[PDB]
Amino acid sequence: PSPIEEQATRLLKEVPLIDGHNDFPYMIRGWFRNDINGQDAHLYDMPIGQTDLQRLQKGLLGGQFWSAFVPCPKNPDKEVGSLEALRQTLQQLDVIHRLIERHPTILQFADSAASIWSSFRAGRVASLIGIEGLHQIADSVSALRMLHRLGVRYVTLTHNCHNAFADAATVSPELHGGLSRKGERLIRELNRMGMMIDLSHTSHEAQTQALRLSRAPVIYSHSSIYSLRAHARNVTDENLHLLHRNRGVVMICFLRELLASEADQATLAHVIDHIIYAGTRIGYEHVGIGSDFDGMLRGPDGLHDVSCYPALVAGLLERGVSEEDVKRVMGLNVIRVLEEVERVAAELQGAGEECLCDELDEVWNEDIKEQLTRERERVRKL
Amino acid sequence: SPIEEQATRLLKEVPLIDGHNDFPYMIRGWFRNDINGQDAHLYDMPIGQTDLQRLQKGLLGGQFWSAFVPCPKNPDKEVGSLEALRQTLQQLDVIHRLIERHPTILQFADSAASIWSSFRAGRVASLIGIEGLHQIADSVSALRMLHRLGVRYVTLTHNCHNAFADAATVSPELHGGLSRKGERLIRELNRMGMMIDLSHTSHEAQTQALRLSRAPVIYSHSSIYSLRAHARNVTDENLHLLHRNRGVVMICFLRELLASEADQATLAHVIDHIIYAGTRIGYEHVGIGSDFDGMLRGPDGLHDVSCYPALVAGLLERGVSEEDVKRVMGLNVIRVLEEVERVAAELQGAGEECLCDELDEVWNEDIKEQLTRERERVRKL
Ligand SMILES: [Fe+3]
Numbered sequence: 225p226s227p228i229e230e231q232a233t234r235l236l237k238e239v240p241l242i243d244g245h246n247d248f249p250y251m252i253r254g255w256f257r258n259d260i261n262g263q264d265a266h267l268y269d270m271p272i273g274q275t276d277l278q279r280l281q282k283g284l285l286g287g288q289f290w291s292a293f294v295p296c297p298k299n300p301d302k303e304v305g306s307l308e309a310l311r312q313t314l315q316q317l318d319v320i321h322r323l324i325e326r327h328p329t330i331l332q333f334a335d336s337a338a339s340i341w342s343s344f345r346a347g348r349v350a351s352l353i354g355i356e357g358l359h360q361i362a363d364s365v366s367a368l369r370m371l372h373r374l375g376v377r378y379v380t381l382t383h384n385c386h387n388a389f390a391d392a393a394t395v396s397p398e399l400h401g402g403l404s405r406k407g408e409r410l411i412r413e414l415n416r417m418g419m420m421i422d423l424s425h426t427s428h429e430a431q432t433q434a435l436r437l438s439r440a441p442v443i444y445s446h447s448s449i450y451s452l453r454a455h456a457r458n459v460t461d462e463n464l465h466l467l468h469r470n471r472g473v474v475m476i477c478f479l480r481e482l483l484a485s486e487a488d489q490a491t492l493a494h495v496i497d498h499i500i501y502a503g504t505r506i507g508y509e510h511v512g513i514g515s516d517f518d519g520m521l522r523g524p525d526g527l528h529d530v531s532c533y534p535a536l537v538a539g540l541l542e543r544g545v546s547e548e549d550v551k552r553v554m555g556l557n558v559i560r561v562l563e564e565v566e567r568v569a570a571e572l573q574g575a576g577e578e579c580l581c582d583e584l585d586e587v588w589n590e591d592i593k594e595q596l597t598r599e600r601e602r603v604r605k606l
Numbered sequence: 607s608p609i610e611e612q613a614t615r616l617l618k619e620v621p622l623i624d625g626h627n628d629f630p631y632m633i634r635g636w637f638r639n640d641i642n643g644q645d646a647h648l649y650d651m652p653i654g655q656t657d658l659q660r661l662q663k664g665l666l667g668g669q670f671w672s673a674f675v676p677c678p679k680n681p682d683k684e685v686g687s688l689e690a691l692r693q694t695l696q697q698l699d700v701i702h703r704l705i706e707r708h709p710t711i712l713q714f715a716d717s718a719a720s721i722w723s724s725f726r727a728g729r730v731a732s733l734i735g736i737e738g739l740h741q742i743a744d745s746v747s748a749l750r751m752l753h754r755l756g757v758r759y760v761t762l763t764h765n766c767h768n769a770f771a772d773a774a775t776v777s778p779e780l781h782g783g784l785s786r787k788g789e790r791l792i793r794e795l796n797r798m799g800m801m802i803d804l805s806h807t808s809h810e811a812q813t814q815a816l817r818l819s820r821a822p823v824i825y826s827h828s829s830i831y832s833l834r835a836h837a838r839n840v841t842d843e844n845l846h847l848l849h850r851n852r853g854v855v856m857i858c859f860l861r862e863l864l865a866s867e868a869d870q871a872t873l874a875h876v877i878d879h880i881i882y883a884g885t886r887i888g889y890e891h892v893g894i895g896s897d898f899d900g901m902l903r904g905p906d907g908l909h910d911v912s913c914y915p916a917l918v919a920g921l922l923e924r925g926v927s928e929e930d931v932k933r934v935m936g937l938n939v940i941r942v943l944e945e946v947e948r949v950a951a952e953l954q955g956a957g958e959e960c961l962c963d964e965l966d967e968v969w970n971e972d973i974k975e976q977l978t979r980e981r982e983r984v985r986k987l
Pocket residue numbers: 245246247291293356516519
């Protein structure tokens with residue numbers, strides 16, 4: 225082992241490398257249909273995908289935001305499709321929690337900066353949860369708050385579907401031209417409840433608007449740099465600057481199509497170029513790692529699966545990024561953002577800000593209400 | 607009065623835990639779950655049998671707050687069932703917000719220990735039940751997430767049949783008790799530590815569930831068939847099977863379940879029903895399950911949540927011992943919840959397999975082949 229490899233191992237022991245996005249729970253849905261009973265051998269050594277419990281240990285990962293992604297609604301009936309996504313979301317959250325609870329020596333649930341650290345002190349992979357698109361809440365802010373209560377700590381505003389709140393990057397034409405009025409109001413509620421905003425998959429204009437409106441720092445859980453590779457899913461220099469002002473973190477993606485114009489030419493070196501570009505221009509306190517492992521068939525050369533994180537840490541150190549800055553990129557930055565999201569929420573909840581409520585149908589007509597008020601006054605007269 | 611001072615002392619010593627109150631649905635009806643700036647009204651409600659001042663006044667120790675939503679009414683049954691799941695999350699949301707915005711009065715509880723600490727702190731222990739398996743949209747995954755959101759009992763039906771069990775008030779019978787899915791769900795409910803509630807279910811569904819369950823169950827709001835014949839009241843057969851199950855029948859204040867003429871129902875009738883059950887299956891298997899806010903008008907002397915001291919005094923006046931009154935008030939339902947937790951921990955300790963939803967295949971064989979081909983390429987590196 226070289227001095228740089230031993231340096232990288234020491235860093236991975238000192239601070240948690242917290243990855244922004246991994247779709248292993250969706251692979252469990254694809255391969256096992258969320259039935260993991262008697263499948264331990266396969267969960268430790270998977271016949272498919274970039275994640276399993278042995279390789280997770282091997283790469284020395286400190287924490288993970290596990291994705292509770294479900295696809296954009298396909299159904300011709302938009303009501304069924306939207307509501308179906310909500311039920312599927314609960315299935316994915318259910319399998320994530322069961323995965324964590326059945327493998328407590330490896331995985332430990334975390335929903336805060338303090339719970340990340342205690343998990344890391346115990347030698348566990350801090351296991352957090354994100355949902356990937358506001359299509360997953362079926363237009364219900366109530367449902368969103370219940371997802372927060374189930375352990376969800378970030379919400380990607382869109383996937384590759386426009387929704388009632390925001391525009392996806394990969395869909396043309398634009399629906400809202402950024403955020404809708406409902407989207408703008410939801411940003412306030414996300415800040416109030418302490419839900420981290422994730423701007424990956426959203427349009428450049430939706431990012432700009434959210435970055436101006438948010439009272440808490442946001443993340444890109446898995447996006448790369450537009451100036452190195454022009455793509456609808458990568459972050460422009462304008463939005464990198466607005467991220468700096470927001471105090472947020474861009475978690476650099478391993479998607480080959482986001483790193484190079486020819487996908488088969490993408491490499492570990494390209495991921496490092498993107499980290500260094502962002503770190504140099506907006507500071508290493510605003511850059512993270514957001515693999516998107518299991519959101520792709522094949523990774524870059526040298527970042528093929530979750531065992532490869534030591535090569536990334538070593539590669540950053542080899543380019544002259546300081547230990548303190550590498551530690552920031554590994555996980556301290558995303559911990560800070562989560563910490564600030566909590567603090568903003570506690571501040572707004574302490575001042576007693578009104579929560580956003582769903583628009584409900586009336587269930588009682590005026591005759592029922594009159595009967596109720598008449599009954600109440602009968603009781604008052606007793 | 608000596609008996610009223612006795613009643614007050616008992617209410618201070620042990621928590622009176624009521625089995626069922628639909629105040630959250632009244633909040634949905636009246637405020638549409640928008641309680642911002644509505645404290646004055648939540649303390650002094652212009653409608654209904656529950657508000658925060660009267661809740662204090664009656665000295666209630668704990669409450670299972672109902673997250674009820676109506677049976678699906680949509681002709682498109684897929685939309686209707688999924689709609690009920692979304693509404694359930696709305697009701698769980700308003701219950702949690704109600705508790706969180708009034709912490710001097712209400713404290714969330716999900717266990718025997720959290721009930722006691724809430725009661726020690728002078729709070730109404732605030733638990734949650736859902737009223738009908740229509741609320742889970744045929745998803746056992748959803749049910750486990752409702753448990754994680756704080757739900758601690760599930761009424762198997764409301765006033766509609768579902769895929770798991772038959773409701774009492776709907777004829778003809780669909781499953782003739784429990785379905786095959788229903789039988790399998792009982793095992794999962796026991797495994798996860800969800801208390802089974804048999805109110806609203808058919809007589810035969812009760813009998814089958816009472817034989818199958820490995821944990822004690824409740825009736826969160828049902829009365830006695832032999833005193834008043836009704837599809838919603840518990841037969842002597844099922845009272846005996848409840849005894850064997852070690853469960854608790856929480857006596858209902860619904861006028862229609864206490865007397866043949868609803869306007870004749872009284873506090874005395876509720877006490878007759880408690881004493882009937884307590885005499886025949888023991889006072890350790892009887893509780894109080896008002897169903898306040900599941901009705902327009904209560905019985906004479908039990909018009910709202912302020913009236914619990916009159917019920918406690920009335921039981922003592924009829925010769926029910928302090929120890930037995932304390933059991934009926936709340937110790938029995940605390941025991942059931944305790945035993946439900948213990949059965950769950952025991953089954954989870956033995957590593958029993960959880961019930962999984964039947965999912966659609968999402969990858970065709972071409973995608974699966976590409977994935978295994980990719981995995982083997984990685985193994986060769
Ligand atoms: Fe993803």
